[PDB]
């Protein structure tokens, strides 16, 4: 029964909710268990980075988030190809790959290939047999310079190009932003029907003299 002013409320408690209630008294235990598993994994892959493979630089999809950039699933095969890495050796040397990702733009392509080349320049490779160093690395740069890396490998970071203050020119002063936006909306709205009317006008024009 309503009582004076109030909000019309709709509790979703008509469906025997007390049989399915998830308490969280095992949350600290879960955190401890996850931390122990992380430490055990980091010990197991001793010089390899604890967080795992390098991830590609990836722009977020929708119009809400396309200004941001984050870490993807794996480097695309086009990126690997133009970086000169085999798609079956990348996962061995710790490069995550994503065969189903495409590269629409050369800017993102080149950003990810410079990322791959930087990772390859910073990689230390241990020979399979330590007593037979075939092509991995010099022993001097892996005796003590090898160290397990903590955190994501080369973390993906949003960068802003800072523009210095400049003198406003008369052309910029005479640009009409609101009018341009309104006319752009109108043109995109009426583009199709304008073309249809031009079509019909041309059809009457080609037969006007008969």
């Amino acid at each position: 029964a309503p009582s004076r002013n109030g909000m019309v409320l709709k509790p979703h408690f008509h469906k025997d909710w007390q049989r399915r209630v998830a308490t969280w008294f095992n949350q600290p235990a879960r955190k401890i268990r996850r931390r122990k598993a992380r430490q055990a994994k980091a010990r197991r892959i001793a010089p390899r980075p604890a967080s795992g493979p390098i991830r590609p630089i990836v722009r977020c999809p929708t119009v809400r988030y396309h200004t941001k950039v984050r870490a993807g699933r794996g480097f695309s095969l086009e990126e690997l190809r133009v970086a000169g890495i085999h798609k079956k050796v990348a996962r061995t040397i710790g490069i995550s790959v994503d065969p189903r990702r495409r590269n629409k733009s050369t800017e993102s392509l080149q950003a990810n290939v410079q990322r791959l080349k930087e990772y390859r320049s910073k990689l230390i490779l241990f020979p399979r047999k330590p007593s037979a160093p075939k092509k991995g690395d010099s022993s001097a740069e892996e005796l003590k310079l090898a160290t397990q890396l903590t955190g994501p490998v080369m973390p993906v970071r949003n960068v802003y190009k800072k523009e210095k203050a400049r003198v406003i020119t008369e052309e910029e002063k005479n640009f009409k932003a609101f009018a341009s936006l309104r006319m752009a909306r109108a043109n995109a709205r009426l583009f199709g029907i304008r073309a249809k009317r031009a079509k019909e006008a041309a059809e009457q024009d080609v037969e006007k003299k008969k």
């Binding site: 523009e163 203050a165 003198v167 406003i168």
Partner: peptide, 8 residues
């Protein structure tokens, strides 16, 4: 000078 800053 008449240089103006850019706000993004």
């Amino acid at each position: 000078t008449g240089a103006a800053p850019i706000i993004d």
